Design an enzyme around this catalytic site. Structure first.
Site, PDB file in Angstrom:
ATOM      1  N   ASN A   1      38.235  41.445  47.865  1.00 59.04           N
ATOM      2  CA  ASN A   1      38.543  41.242  46.408  1.00 59.04           C
ATOM      3  C   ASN A   1      39.653  40.300  46.187  1.00 59.04           C
ATOM      4  O   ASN A   1      40.686  40.219  46.899  1.00 59.04           O
ATOM      5  CB  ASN A   1      38.789  42.624  45.743  1.00 59.04           C
ATOM      6  CG  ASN A   1      40.211  43.024  45.790  1.00 59.04           C
ATOM      7  OD1 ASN A   1      41.027  42.657  44.948  1.00 59.04           O
ATOM      8  ND2 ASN A   1      40.555  43.785  46.869  1.00 59.04           N
TER       9      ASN A   1
ATOM     10  N   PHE B   1      45.078  41.398  39.540  1.00 61.62           N
ATOM     11  CA  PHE B   1      45.731  42.261  38.582  1.00 61.62           C
ATOM     12  C   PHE B   1      45.157  42.077  37.156  1.00 61.62           C
ATOM     13  O   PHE B   1      45.922  41.847  36.200  1.00 61.62           O
ATOM     14  CB  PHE B   1      47.244  42.063  38.533  1.00 61.62           C
ATOM     15  CG  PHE B   1      48.055  42.582  39.704  1.00 61.62           C
ATOM     16  CD1 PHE B   1      47.675  43.616  40.538  1.00 61.62           C
ATOM     17  CD2 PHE B   1      49.346  42.015  39.910  1.00 61.62           C
ATOM     18  CE1 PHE B   1      48.531  44.060  41.533  1.00 61.62           C
ATOM     19  CE2 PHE B   1      50.213  42.502  40.918  1.00 61.62           C
ATOM     20  CZ  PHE B   1      49.731  43.488  41.767  1.00 61.62           C
TER      21      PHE B   1
ATOM     22  N   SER C   1      50.032  43.051  46.932  1.00 55.50           N
ATOM     23  CA  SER C   1      48.795  42.421  46.607  1.00 55.50           C
ATOM     24  C   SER C   1      48.706  41.011  47.223  1.00 55.50           C
ATOM     25  O   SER C   1      49.622  40.219  47.140  1.00 55.50           O
ATOM     26  CB  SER C   1      48.616  42.242  45.097  1.00 55.50           C
ATOM     27  OG  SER C   1      47.416  41.487  44.892  1.00 55.50           O
TER      28      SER C   1
ATOM     29  N   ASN D   1      46.780  38.763  46.078  1.00 54.34           N
ATOM     30  CA  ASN D   1      46.118  37.957  45.035  1.00 54.34           C
ATOM     31  C   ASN D   1      47.003  37.511  43.908  1.00 54.34           C
ATOM     32  O   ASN D   1      46.476  37.111  42.856  1.00 54.34           O
ATOM     33  CB  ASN D   1      44.926  38.753  44.511  1.00 54.34           C
ATOM     34  CG  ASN D   1      43.947  39.118  45.656  1.00 54.34           C
ATOM     35  OD1 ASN D   1      43.711  38.258  46.525  1.00 54.34           O
ATOM     36  ND2 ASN D   1      43.435  40.337  45.690  1.00 54.34           N
ATOM     37  N   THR D   2      48.306  37.656  44.080  1.00 49.80           N
ATOM     38  CA  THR D   2      49.272  37.159  43.054  1.00 49.80           C
ATOM     39  C   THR D   2      50.270  36.326  43.844  1.00 49.80           C
ATOM     40  O   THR D   2      50.909  36.844  44.785  1.00 49.80           O
ATOM     41  CB  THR D   2      49.965  38.321  42.300  1.00 49.80           C
ATOM     42  OG1 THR D   2      48.984  38.941  41.472  1.00 49.80           O
ATOM     43  CG2 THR D   2      51.134  37.823  41.469  1.00 49.80           C
TER      44      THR D   2
ATOM     45  N   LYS E   1      54.526  50.121  48.196  1.00 51.27           N
ATOM     46  CA  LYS E   1      53.248  49.874  48.889  1.00 51.27           C
ATOM     47  C   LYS E   1      53.366  48.529  49.606  1.00 51.27           C
ATOM     48  O   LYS E   1      53.578  47.467  48.995  1.00 51.27           O
ATOM     49  CB  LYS E   1      52.071  49.890  47.917  1.00 51.27           C
ATOM     50  CG  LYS E   1      50.733  49.728  48.589  1.00 51.27           C
ATOM     51  CD  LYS E   1      49.601  50.085  47.617  1.00 51.27           C
ATOM     52  CE  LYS E   1      48.227  49.997  48.271  1.00 51.27           C
ATOM     53  NZ  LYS E   1      47.170  50.436  47.349  1.00 51.27           N
TER      54      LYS E   1
ATOM     55  N   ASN F   1      48.104  48.157  51.809  1.00 46.90           N
ATOM     56  CA  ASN F   1      47.242  47.362  50.923  1.00 46.90           C
ATOM     57  C   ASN F   1      46.157  46.683  51.773  1.00 46.90           C
ATOM     58  O   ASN F   1      46.019  46.921  53.029  1.00 46.90           O
ATOM     59  CB  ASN F   1      48.086  46.323  50.200  1.00 46.90           C
ATOM     60  CG  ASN F   1      47.559  46.077  48.804  1.00 46.90           C
ATOM     61  OD1 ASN F   1      46.324  45.823  48.542  1.00 46.90           O
ATOM     62  ND2 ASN F   1      48.504  46.150  47.838  1.00 46.90           N
TER      63      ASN F   1
HETATM   64  C1  LIG Z   1      38.543  46.188  44.475  1.00 53.34           C
HETATM   65  C2  LIG Z   1      39.902  46.582  44.903  1.00 53.34           C
HETATM   66  C3  LIG Z   1      40.949  46.528  44.016  1.00 53.34           C
HETATM   67  C4  LIG Z   1      42.230  46.920  44.360  1.00 53.34           C
HETATM   68  N1  LIG Z   1      43.243  46.831  43.504  1.00 53.34           N
HETATM   69  C5  LIG Z   1      44.491  47.362  43.842  1.00 53.34           C
HETATM   70  C6  LIG Z   1      45.591  47.416  42.925  1.00 53.34           C
HETATM   71  O1  LIG Z   1      45.426  47.079  41.686  1.00 53.34           O
HETATM   72  N2  LIG Z   1      46.742  47.879  43.358  1.00 53.34           N
HETATM   73  C7  LIG Z   1      46.993  48.277  44.661  1.00 53.34           C
HETATM   74  O2  LIG Z   1      48.116  48.671  45.025  1.00 53.34           O
HETATM   75  N3  LIG Z   1      45.993  48.268  45.592  1.00 53.34           N
HETATM   76  C8  LIG Z   1      44.760  47.891  45.217  1.00 53.34           C
HETATM   77  N4  LIG Z   1      43.725  47.849  46.098  1.00 53.34           N
HETATM   78  C9  LIG Z   1      43.967  48.307  47.456  1.00 53.34           C
HETATM   79  C10 LIG Z   1      43.536  49.721  47.711  1.00 53.34           C
HETATM   80  O3  LIG Z   1      44.410  50.593  46.966  1.00 53.34           O
HETATM   81  C11 LIG Z   1      43.730  50.118  49.190  1.00 53.34           C
HETATM   82  O4  LIG Z   1      45.126  49.900  49.558  1.00 53.34           O
HETATM   83  C12 LIG Z   1      42.897  49.246  50.146  1.00 53.34           C
HETATM   84  O5  LIG Z   1      41.648  48.863  49.548  1.00 53.34           O
HETATM   85  C13 LIG Z   1      42.621  49.977  51.482  1.00 53.34           C
HETATM   86  O6  LIG Z   1      41.871  51.172  51.308  1.00 53.34           O
HETATM   87  P1  LIG Z   1      40.275  51.220  51.496  1.00 53.34           P
HETATM   88  O7  LIG Z   1      39.988  50.524  52.817  1.00 53.34           O
HETATM   89  O8  LIG Z   1      40.004  52.732  51.519  1.00 53.34           O
HETATM   90  O9  LIG Z   1      39.637  50.490  50.295  1.00 53.34           O
HETATM   91  C14 LIG Z   1      42.430  47.422  45.706  1.00 53.34           C
HETATM   92  C15 LIG Z   1      41.346  47.528  46.602  1.00 53.34           C
HETATM   93  C16 LIG Z   1      40.103  47.102  46.258  1.00 53.34           C
HETATM   94  C17 LIG Z   1      38.952  47.214  47.239  1.00 53.34           C
HETATM   95  O1  LIG Z   2      43.567  41.644  43.197  1.00 54.74           O
HETATM   96  C1  LIG Z   2      44.017  42.771  42.785  1.00 54.74           C
HETATM   97  O2  LIG Z   2      44.186  43.092  41.610  1.00 54.74           O
HETATM   98  C2  LIG Z   2      44.422  43.647  43.905  1.00 54.74           C
HETATM   99  C3  LIG Z   2      43.715  43.552  45.080  1.00 54.74           C
HETATM  100  C4  LIG Z   2      44.156  44.177  46.193  1.00 54.74           C
HETATM  101  O3  LIG Z   2      43.454  44.134  47.230  1.00 54.74           O
HETATM  102  N1  LIG Z   2      45.392  44.750  46.218  1.00 54.74           N
HETATM  103  C5  LIG Z   2      46.163  44.748  45.117  1.00 54.74           C
HETATM  104  O4  LIG Z   2      47.309  45.247  45.206  1.00 54.74           O
HETATM  105  N2  LIG Z   2      45.691  44.156  43.926  1.00 54.74           N
END
Ligand SMILES: Cc1cc2nc3c(=O)[nH]c(=O)nc-3n(C[C@H](O)[C@H](O)[C@H](O)COP(=O)(O)O)c2cc1C
Ligand SMILES: O=C(O)c1cc(=O)[nH]c(=O)[nH]1
Ligand SMILES: COC(=O)/C(C#N)=C1\SCC(=O)N1c1ccc(-c2ccc(OC)cc2)cc1F
Length: 364
Positions: free
Chosen positions: A113, A117, A183, A185-186, A223, A252
């Site tokens: 992804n 944000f 993240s 992506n920022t 995080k 993350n």
């Molecule tokens: C689609 C998507 C969006 C995410 N957005 C956020 C986010 O807004 N904030 C954040 O701290 N982590 C975000 N994450 C990270 C997840 O919280 C998690 O740290 C990471 O995906 C690893 O766990 P998983 O392998 O069980 O998905 C996102 C993950 C995915 C797949």
């Molecule tokens: O792109 C996001 O909003 C998002 C993705 C991700 O993998 N982790 C996160 O902290 N934010």
């Protein structure tokens, strides 16, 4: 709600019909309306954990990113999660990146992804949480806490002030807050994990947090990425100790692309989640636990899709775990699955409960 049916028919069909962002929007909708499989698993006492000033009825949470705007919290508890984390939320609303910005790698059981944000912003989420604030108070007392994950706007000048505003607005309404500095992506965000930047940021966050009336005063966690150098990790641990940070969320998504990925979309820009992240995250937990002397609670996340994966992170040092990407593939039944398997393995490995397993690999 059958584990087999979801895994072998429902989720493959939804995946065959919808692009991953549409599928996620539909999932949030269904969850927010309570249209879910039952869920029968009843949490035993062996799964309760006490940490961060709270009771957790089970140690399995929904990771940030699934319910970015706090729309589905009650439906996530109904799914069987022990705790729910919403966000990331940014101060002002913002749309995130252009679509497509999320990609499935089914042959890898992974996702990439680059949402950037997408957030309804603090004001909208504040009002949304306020509408159910006492319902959450009761949930929290019954062992079902709420975390709120804070981000920063794309065009913000002063990152620390973005996080401070989040603490001020949503802190009251959260059992714990997460400063998301990982993240991928920022632009520039991950540089906030650097020693000097992190200490300045977290001093300001903690000052704002400590300024909140005792009943509304959340725990504060940071995080972190799975891609940190040894120096970065040592620096984070030092700051976490110097300032009395409540806990760490580890990890993350990764900007790495581990050798062996098969998905056609493996070279898309973004963070990679799911199975290929699993052991990288586990390793990061293990290292952070050791560097903090086991005195700083860790919420372990990345690639958890079974009880074994949960227990591995627990034994490495996590007090709690979260999952996100496993749901995409296996659907809601995976929650009860992880929990039932985790309880079975704890018994098999001679632990009286989750608590006894936390950090067990370090005492061997
Ligand atoms: C689609 C998507 C969006 C995410 N957005 C956020 C986010 O807004 N904030 C954040 O701290 N982590 C975000 N994450 C990270 C997840 O919280 C998690 O740290 C990471 O995906 C690893 O766990 P998983 O392998 O069980 O998905 C996102 C993950 C995915 C797949
Ligand atoms: O792109 C996001 O909003 C998002 C993705 C991700 O993998 N982790 C996160 O902290 N934010
Ligand atoms: C046509 O769509 C459906 O029937 C869906 C969906 N989506 C249905 S039918 C009964 C049901 O549990 N769902 C459903 C499937 C997946 C998800 C879901 C998918 C991903 C998640 O990420 C953590 C969390 C939940 C939620 C759902 F609520």
């Amino acid at each position: 709600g059958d584990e087999r049916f979801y895994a072998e028919h429902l989720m493959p069909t939804l995946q065959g019909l919808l692009d991953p962002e549409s599928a996620h929007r539909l999932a949030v909708r269904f969850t927010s309306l309570g249209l879910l499989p039952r869920a029968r698993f009843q949490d035993s006492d062996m799964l309760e954990v006490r940490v961060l000033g709270h009771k957790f009825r089970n140690p399995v949470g929904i990771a940030a990113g699934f319910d970015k705007h706090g729309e589905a919290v009650d439906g996530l508890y109904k799914m069987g999660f022990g705790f729910v984390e919403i966000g990331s939320v940014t101060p002002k609303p913002q749309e995130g990146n252009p679509r497509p910005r999320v990609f499935r790698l089914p042959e890898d059981q992974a996702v990439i992804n680059r949402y950037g944000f997408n957030s309804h912003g603090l004001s909208v989420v504040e009002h949304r949480l306020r509408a159910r604030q006492q319902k959450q108070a009761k949930l929290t007392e019954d062992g079902l806490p709420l975390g709120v994950n804070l981000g920063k706007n794309k065009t913000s000048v002063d990152a620390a002030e973005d996080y401070a505003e989040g603490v001020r607005v949503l802190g009251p309404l959260a059992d714990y807050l997460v400063v998301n500095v990982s993240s991928p992506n920022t632009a520039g965000l991950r540089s906030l994990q650097g020693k000097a930047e992190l200490r300045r940021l977290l001093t300001k966050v903690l000052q704002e947090r400590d300024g909140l009336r005792r009943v509304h005063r959340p725990a504060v966690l940071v995080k972190i990425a799975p891609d940190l150098t040894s120096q970065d990790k040592e620096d984070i641990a030092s700051v976490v100790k110097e300032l009395g940070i409540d806990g760490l969320i580890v990890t993350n998504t990764t900007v790495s692309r581990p050798a062996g990925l098969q998905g056609a979309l493996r070279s898309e820009t973004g963070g990679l989640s799911g199975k290929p992240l699993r052991d990288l995250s586990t390793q990061t937990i293990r290292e952070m636990y050791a560097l903090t002397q086991g005195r700083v609670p860790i919420i372990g996340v990345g690639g958890v899709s079974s009880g074994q994966d949960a227990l591995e992170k627990i034994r490495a040092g996590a007090s709690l775990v979260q999952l996100y990407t496993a749901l995409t593939f296996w659907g809601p039944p995976v929650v009860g699955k992880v929990k039932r398997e985790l309880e079975a393995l704890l018994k098999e490995q001679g632990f009286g409960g989750v608590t006894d397993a936390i950090g067990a690999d370090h005492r061997r």
